[PDB]
Write a protein that binds this ligand. Structure first.
Ligand code: CDL
Ligand code: CDL
Ligand code: 3PH
Ligand code: 3PH
Ligand code: HEM
Ligand code: HEM
Ligand code: HEM
Ligand code: HEM
Ligand code: UQ5
Ligand code: UQ5
Ligand code: UQ5
Ligand code: UQ5
Lengths: 122, 50, 52, 48, 59, 70, 55, 376, 376, 48
């Protein structure tokens, strides 16, 4: 497997860049980013990564989500001057989330759990 | 009470701060789905009849 | 024999014509009352400091 | 997600899996179900 | 632009106890008109085929 | 009830200060074309697969009926 | 165009110029949708006129 | 303030009037209210029909006819019940396909998906035993063919079959017990629906964008009552057309013949909403393997919130494979209504294999690749 | 906690395991769990019964006989379902008398009392129309006598009566609709029971001392599970005695005769739990006034949380008057099984007058005097 | 202590009772139920 898995990575990278191009074209009309597509209810690591963030980053993420949901209700897209400024691949969460997942993988090899649970309501 | 100690805003001439210090009377709504009537249109609405 | 299988076909069709007419008018009236209630939301203005 | 995302994220390790003694004591409930079914149906010539 | 009249508002719309009987009489007349239109269209289209046409023909 | 930190100005107009269904006639052809532009690929691949497999099956069934004849 | 033409043909029970005009109006309205406004009327007229000239 | 003084006002206000809901919900989020309305319609028209039906093999068909002709408004009630079952299955199938498209069963809504699969199984059993009540040829022979699948289980198959029948064949005790079970199971459906809805209100609905929506929530009662009324009126139009203009369109003509246990029809087929399961069963030339395949389909439906990755519009590979899955299930629906033939057997086998491939291979693996593409 | 992660386990834990209950509750607080057990038993036995019963004239009596002699365990099921109605009414009556003795409907438990009175009315209607179903002489003639009492409302009389009957006399349409109504009403009973229990849990139960018990509360699920099990075993002993040794003791022998509309029995009396209302009706020499008095009894029952002052012990005058009320009600129960005689008419009139006097004069005025004596 | 206890304590005065206008506005609902029943049944020209 190692003989063919040396060059199976550039094909993965090309497919990933094509995928991100198409989806980022879809995302930019709503003013969203790739990291806004991660739900703290859907993943407890994302919920942990989101409380490790400074408050202005969280305020900006909430503002972008509110704008996108308003656009989705109105069946609209962003205007051309806003749409040309959109940066769908500017990460704000991937470093913190990668650190959180690495910590959870480290605790699991020693039999320890994660020091957080799912978000439980009511 | 003062707004700096109660609302605690960020400092700067951001778009939200400009409307907070001096709101404009020329409010623009979105008109892709509904066109507004002329402002100050009086009378009981025609939607009750409908 | 076709009458014997469906003895009330004429009455059913008259009732169906009345029902289709009434429901078709009510669809327009309900669409009107739906769009009236949702109008302050569909035309709201949100301004924020985010540009991205 | 919790089912296959946990296997793919590397969260399912041998140190986190249940022990072989735990699997022995949990799997002993299988004989209880067999004897409960035999008590309910009584489909035996076992009494002799 | 088009707007409901004030004097017509103060009579049939301001109280629900006046609005509801007006609603019921309007409902009665609307049902009568829909019944009339449907029956007239059906009898005009199927003229000569109904049982009453044969009975009135035999007079 | 789930405090959300956010900075905004929101404006809303009375529903008796705007129209209700008049813009629905203007936007109707554009919305039709936008709907088919967005869902064109999925509806087409559904139609191609369903009608192609159904047509192939019905054709071969007719050939099977013809093969039983004398 | 062809489906609308034959549908109106079979619905009216006779062959005349009405089916071509209706099919032209439908096809031209399909072409003219989404465009500024001389065009959602102008294109049904052009396709119906092509049908009428054909007849 | 007034709803703060009585518990029943408070619960109703919280869960019906002031319940927060995402503002960008489209008309694909109306299937639940329509399914609830169709369940209420089925319960009302069934309760009204039960006052004239007799569950005996000498009077069942005759009482159906007498209700059709002599009872005032009895034809409307009988056609409304028989076609409301089909519209109930249409609305529920579209609801499930919405959930499959958006991946709505994912965390934290695993309980909602599992209670949904439970509801669908109860619905299938309810409709199947309700169809036997007119005691026509299809009603008799379909119950004979389907309850004879218990003999595929070795050793104790015929004993379970005779215990369910009450005898050596489908006869009067079968009809009486089917009538009691059929009257009973809709109330279990109402309870399951109440539990299913109260499970969703813990976290709320998902939105068409697939993002977190806690920043943009509006009251349910003021806004989504009218939006649900619009869809209810569109459903009432289709219901009126089916009841009054084409009442036997979705039925079978053989169910108007009285039941004869000594002469089977040439083409025993179920109602249309059981045809995909029937095609899965007929495609496999082994009764035990067919029953196992149906059970594995429903096990894969239960295991969706734990093996499924991949959701709505922004996850484009699974979004494209959804339409292939939809074409596959409609091909299974069409294949069930056709006779056994080598090409239909082959095509049914391939379609069942593709359904299993989509459920168990595409949803975990392709979902994981697109998560790695988007966020790796 | 494991129950803190699934919302179903949280509700079940909160309302059945850890629910704080006063520790000094005696064995007269076991009426409600016994009533729920009897409701569940009636539902189970009836659902089993409906698989062998045919709801048509000229088949109903024969289907009950075939159930009794040919269905395995069918005699046990029928006798259990017949005597379970009597035990259900015994338990619910003792529950109501407990609430009357302790003043259990007072503030803040008025909704509990009102929902109880609604449950009692639905229980009465359910038991009556279920008693019509075997289609004997008592069934037919009791259904005739009771439903032909709508000719007391002026003008709109026999119209309502003929719409109830589906004809001009009690016949096959009346039996056929009574089967459907009787099958359906116990699910409304179960839902109303769930609402009734949920209304009590807002404030918890009263105690035999009649004081505030917030300082001395213990867990329900450990301490009051075995205490309910003891009373359930006593009820099972009485139930087993009634089923196996005296199965026809509480019934009427005339209901074993097939119904004859042209021949009436000598004495037409209902089941024992309907006898006090029958005595109130039969004592007054006017039909409209008898129906008005029957309605006034239940209106005074609804008004009891808003007019009734006075509880258990430490309020001794109303405590003593409770025993006169109990004797009055038991006398009305005895009088309903007798014949119409001038002395029995006079005694029944006096008993009805004292029942109204206690419900409307003693409970407010004597209770106010007790409050002025104790805390004035 | 809602009901007869409120009037025994003197909590029901001439004040805190509904006004004549309030009773007339509530009393105007009597015609609505009459008109609704006549609309539902339709006994036309049935008044003697
Ligand atoms: C006919 C051809 C069939 C094929 C094309 C289908 C329609 C074409 C347009 C499609 C579309 O986008 O539909 C929405 C489209 C416009 O949508 P949009 O404004 O972009 O966005 C709003 C949402 O999409 C919609 O959300 P909303 O809730 O705001 O709007 C609700 C309401 C919009 O409300 C309306 O305006 C509809 C009015 C109903 C007519 C009933 C009249 C009878 C009674 C009259 C009483 C009215 C009282 C009002 C009086 C006061 C007026 C001053 O829409 C409806 O429910 C009506 C049906 C819409 C499409 C349903 C069918 C889709 C599948 C196609 C199947 C056909 C094969 O609305 C209409 O279709 C209504 C206009 C009529 C179009 C005819 C051609 C115009 C040129
Ligand atoms: C089908 C079920 C959905 C009906 C939604 C109820 C409603 O808002 O009335 C629309 C509609 C009344 O027509 P509309 O004149 O266009 O609506 C009244 C105003 O537009 C606006 O009236 P509103 O804003 O005062 O409506 C608030 C609504 C209270 O609305 C709620 O709290 C809705 C709670 C249930 C939601 C059901 C969704 C399924 O209470 C009512 O006035 C109607 C109570 C009957 C429910 O309901 C009907 O009576 C239509 C038949 C439905 C049965
Ligand atoms: C022998 C018996 C004769 C029976 C004759 C009647 C058979 C059925 C009627 C004819 C059906 C054929 C045309 C159907 C058109 C339906 C509409 C449609 O497809 O549009 C959906 C769809 C619309 O997309 P949307 O508008 O984006 O939703 O159109 C397409 O995307 C095009 C579909 C083309 C694929 C199907 C082509 C026909 C398959 C035939 C295969 C034959 C295999 C031969 C192999 C053996 C050779 C020896
Ligand atoms: C998650 C699992 C999902 C499973 C999905 C199952 C399928 C769901 C969608 C099915 C669509 C309905 C098809 C029903 C008829 C099938 C008949 C068949 O295959 O056998 C042919 C069958 C037998 O043919 P033969 O045995 O081959 O001769 O023919 C018939 O019985 C007549 C067919 C009549 C078709 C009527 C079509 C229009 C009915 C109304 C449509 C309403 C659409 C939605 C509107 C309401 C929206 C709320
Ligand atoms: C409390 C609720 C219900 C009652 C009392 C009831 C009762 C009945 C009765 C008495 C019949 C036989 C009369 C006839 O054949 O027309 C019947 C038929 C039927 N019922 Fe219901 N039903 C109920 C709910 C449902 C539900 C929820 C479904 C869901 C699919 C359903 C599906 C059917 C079907 C398919 C038939 C056969 C109709 C035919 O082909 O004639 N029923 N029901
Ligand atoms: C009698 C049958 C049913 C009733 C009355 C019902 C009712 C509802 C209602 C009212 C909603 C909220 C809004 C909506 O999405 O429409 C909902 C959501 C949902 N239902 Fe159903 N449902 C039924 C069957 C099912 C079935 C059979 C499934 C799946 C196998 C299912 C799965 C779901 C899911 C996953 C959601 C959450 C979707 C979301 O919020 O994005 N339900 N249901
Ligand atoms: C099927 C019928 C009924 C069921 C299942 C039921 C159930 C219960 C249960 C489980 C309790 C709590 C335990 C207990 O105190 O026994 C309770 C309390 C109570 N019930 Fe019932 N009940 C029924 C009928 C009634 C009726 C007919 C009435 C009155 C007319 C009534 C009035 C009350 C009251 C006032 C309490 C509170 C007693 C106190 O806490 O002092 N219930 N009920
Ligand atoms: C889902 C619930 C129930 C079902 C299906 C049911 C069913 C039946 C059936 C089929 C019969 C006629 C057969 C026979 O009389 O042996 C019957 C009779 C009867 N039912 Fe039930 N029942 C239910 C609940 C109840 C309840 C809750 C009560 C009382 C409050 C009740 C009281 C009676 C009585 C008194 C009879 C007359 C029995 C006799 O004298 O033979 N039933 N029921
Ligand atoms: C945002 O999401 C949501 C929706 O989507 C847009 C909804 O639509 C609703 C509202 C839900 C509806 C309309 C579905 C109906 C609910 C259920 C549980 C269906 C089952 C109930 C039945 C059949 C009741 C019939 C039985 C009765 C009355 C008992 C018998 C008694 C008598 C006949 C007297 C809610 C709360 C919601 O949050
Ligand atoms: C015309 O006829 C026919 C039907 O009908 C309309 C059919 O559907 C089907 C085929 C349907 C399939 C394969 C899907 C539905 C399958 C099953 C097995 C339905 C479930 C019902 C069963 C097992 C009957 C037993 C009933 C019980 C257990 C009562 C429930 C009570 C409790 C669990 C306590 C066929 C062929 C048919 O030709
Ligand atoms: C010998 O004779 C007699 C009987 O006979 C054996 C009796 O039993 C009774 C006892 C009955 C009493 C006191 C009245 C019962 C109460 C009511 C309201 C009458 C029943 C009403 C009916 C049947 C109307 C139709 C309604 C039905 C079936 C259900 C309605 C549905 C809902 C509420 C959802 C008496 C007195 C009697 O002397
Ligand atoms: C004053 O203190 C209190 C008591 O006094 C000590 C009580 O007694 C109770 C209530 C007691 C309860 C709830 C237990 C009694 C049982 C009831 C009401 C129901 C009986 C049911 C039984 C035996 C089993 C039913 C089984 C099934 C399978 C039906 C369910 C159906 C499905 C799952 C589909 C309460 C709340 C209380 O506060």
């Amino acid at each position: 497997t190692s003989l063919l898995k040396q060059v199976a990575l550039p094909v993965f990278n090309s497919l990933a860049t094509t995928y991100r191009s198409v989806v980022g074209a879809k995302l930019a009309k709503y003013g969203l980013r790739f990291d806004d597509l991660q739900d703290p209810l859907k993943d407890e690591d994302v919920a942990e990564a989101l409380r490790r963030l400074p408050p202005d980053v969280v305020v900006a993420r909430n503002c972008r989500l509110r704008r996108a949901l308003d656009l989705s209700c109105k069946h609209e897209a962003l205007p051309k001057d806003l749409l040309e400024k959109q940066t769908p691949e500017l990460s704000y969460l991937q470093d913190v989330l990668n650190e959180v997942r690495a910590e959870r993988r480290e605790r699991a090899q020693l039999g320890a759990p994660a020091p957080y649970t799912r978000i439980y309501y009511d | 009470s003062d707004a700096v100690e109660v609302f605690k805003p960020e400092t700067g001439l951001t778009p939200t701060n400009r409307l907070s210090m001096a709101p404009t009377p020329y409010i623009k709504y979105d008109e892709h789905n509904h066109k507004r009537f002329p402002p100050g249109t009086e009378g009981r609405p025609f939607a009750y009849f409908v | 024999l076709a009458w014997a299988s469906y003895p009330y076909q004429d009455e059913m069709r008259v009732m169906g014509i009345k029902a289709c007419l009434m429901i078709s008018i009510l669809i327009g009236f309900a669409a009107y009352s739906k769009r009236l209630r949702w109008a302050p939301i569909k035309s709201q203005r949100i301004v924020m400091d985010v540009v991205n | 997600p919790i089912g296959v995302w946990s296997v793919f994220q590397g969260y399912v390790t041998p140190a986190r899996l249940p022990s072989i003694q735990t699997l022995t004591r949990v799997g002993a409930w299988g004989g209880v179900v067999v004897v409960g079914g035999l008590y309910m149906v009584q489909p035996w010539d076992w009494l002799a | 632009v088009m707007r409901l009249s004030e004097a017509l508002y103060q009579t049939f719309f301001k109280r629900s106890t006046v609005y509801i009987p007006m609603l019921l009489v309007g409902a009665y007349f609307s049902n009568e008109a829909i019944d009339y239109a449907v029956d007239k269209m059906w009898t005009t289209r199927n003229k000569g085929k109904l049982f009453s046409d044969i009975i009135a023909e035999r007079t | 009830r789930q405090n959300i930190p956010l900075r905004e100005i929101l404006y809303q107009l009375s529903p008796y200060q705007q129209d209700v269904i008049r813009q629905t006639f203007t936007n109707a052809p554009k919305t039709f074309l936008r709907f088919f532009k967005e869902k064109g690929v999925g509806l087409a691949t559904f139609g191609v697969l369903f009608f192609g497999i159904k047509g192939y099956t019905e054709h071969e069934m007719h050939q099977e009926r013809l093969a039983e004849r004398y | 165009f062809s489906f609308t033409d034959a549908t109106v043909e079979n619905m009216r029970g006779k062959h005349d110029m009405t089916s071509g005009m209706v099919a032209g109006a439908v096809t031209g309205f399909l072409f003219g949708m989404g465009r500024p406004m001389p065009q959602p009327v102008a294109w049904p007229l052009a396709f119906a006129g092509a049908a009428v000239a054909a007849d | 303030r007034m709803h703060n003084k009585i518990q029943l006002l408070s619960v109703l206000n919280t869960h019906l009037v002031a319940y927060p809901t995402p503002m960008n919900l489209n008309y694909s989020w109306n299937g639940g209210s329509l399914a609830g309305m169709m369940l209420a319609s089925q319960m009302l028209t069934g309760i009204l029909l039960a006052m004239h039906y007799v569950g005996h093999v000498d009077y069942a068909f005759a009482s159906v006819q007498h209700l059709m002709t002599d009872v005032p408004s009895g034809m409307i009630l009988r056609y409304a019940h028989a076609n409301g079952a089909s519209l109930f299955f249409i609305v529920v199938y579209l609801h499930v396909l919405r959930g499959m498209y958006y991946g709505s069963g994912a965390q934290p809504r695993e309980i909602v998906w599992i209670s949904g699969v439970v509801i669908l199984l109860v619905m299938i059993i309810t409709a199947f035993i309700g169809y036997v009540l007119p005691w026509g040829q299809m009603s008799f022979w379909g119950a004979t063919v389907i309850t004879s699948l218990a003999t595929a289980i070795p050793v104790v198959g015929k004993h379970i079959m005779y215990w369910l029948w009450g005898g050596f064949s489908v006869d009067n005790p079968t009809l009486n017990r089917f009538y009691s079970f059929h009257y009973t199971l809709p109330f279990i459906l109402a309870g399951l629906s109440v539990f299913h809805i109260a499970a969703l209100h813990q976290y709320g609905s998902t939105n068409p964008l697939g993002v977190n929506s806690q920043s943009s929530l509006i009251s349910f009662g003021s806004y989504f009552g009218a939006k649900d009324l619009v869809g209810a009126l569109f459903l009432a139009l289709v219901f009126s057309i089916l009841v009054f203009f084409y009442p036997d369109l979705l039925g079978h003509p053989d169910n108007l013949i009285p039941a004869n246990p000594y002469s089977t029809p040439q083409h025993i087929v179920p109602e249309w909403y059981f045809l995909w399961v029937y095609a899965i069963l007929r495609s496999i030339p082994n009764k035990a393997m067919g029953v196992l395949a149906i059970g594995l389909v429903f096990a894969s439906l239960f295991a969706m919130p734990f093996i499924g990755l991949g959701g709505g519009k922004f996850r484009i590979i699974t979004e494209w494979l959804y339409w292939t899955f939809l074409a596959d299930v409609l091909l299974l629906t069409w294949l069930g209504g056709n006779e056994i033939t080598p090409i239909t057997s082959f095509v049914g086998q391939c379609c069942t294999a593709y359904l299993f491939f989509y459920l168990l291979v595409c949803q975990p693996l392709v979902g994981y690749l697109e998560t790695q593409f988007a966020h790796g």
